[PDB]
Amino acid sequence: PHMTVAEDKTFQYIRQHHSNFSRIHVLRILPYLSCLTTSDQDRLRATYERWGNQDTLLELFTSLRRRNGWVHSLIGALRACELSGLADEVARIYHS
């Protein structure tokens, strides 16, 4: 019963507006996402190498969604990676 209404709403927003998020660079954002496990990190770096940014970004969001507090992890990480506008939009949806 983990996932909250706000989390789901946020995930669905990112899904519907995925092209808004295309300038995330997966490799740069990964170490900031403290909600990911070391195993998650390992797998996502290896996924990136094989499939590239665009497909790995899809996998990143579904990977995030399985973890505690991913929304706030993502918001923090977006700010840390010079994407504060994306952070603001995500926070706005979460609190809506």
Residue numbers in the entry: -1 to 94
Paper text:
Recognition of viral RNAs by RLRs leads to the activation of mitochondrial antiviral signaling protein (MAVS; also known as IPS1, VISA and CARDIF). Activated MAVS triggers rapid production of type I interferons and proinflammatory cytokines. It consists of an N-terminal CARD domain, a proline-rich region (PRR) preceding a poorly structured middle segment, and a monotopic transmembrane (TM) domain at the very C-terminus. The N-terminal CARD domain of MAVS is necessary and sufficient for forming active MAVS aggregates.
At the inter-strand interface, the positive and negative charges are alternately distributed at two opposite ends of each CARD subunit, indicating that the inter-strand interaction is mainly electrostatic. The positively charged residues R37 in the 3rd helix (H3), R64 and R65 in the loop between the 4th and 5th helices (H4 and H5) from the CARD in a lower layer (purple in Figure 2B) are in close proximity to the negatively charged residues D23 in the loop between the 1st and 2nd helices (H1b and H2) and E26 in the 2nd helix (H2) of another CARD molecule (cyan in Figure 2B) in the upper layer. E26, R64 and R65 are highly conserved among MAVS molecules from different species, but D23 and R37 are less so. To test the energetic contributions of these charged residues to the stability of the filament and the in vivo MAVS signaling activity, we mutated them individually to an alanine residue or residues with reversed charges. Compared with the wild-type MAVS, which potently induced IFNβ in a dose-dependent manner, point mutations at multiple locations of the inter-strand interface abolished MAVS activity. The gel-filtration profiles (E26R as an example in Figure 2—figure supplement 1A) and the EM images of the negatively stained proteins verified that these mutations impaired the filament formation of the MAVS CARD.
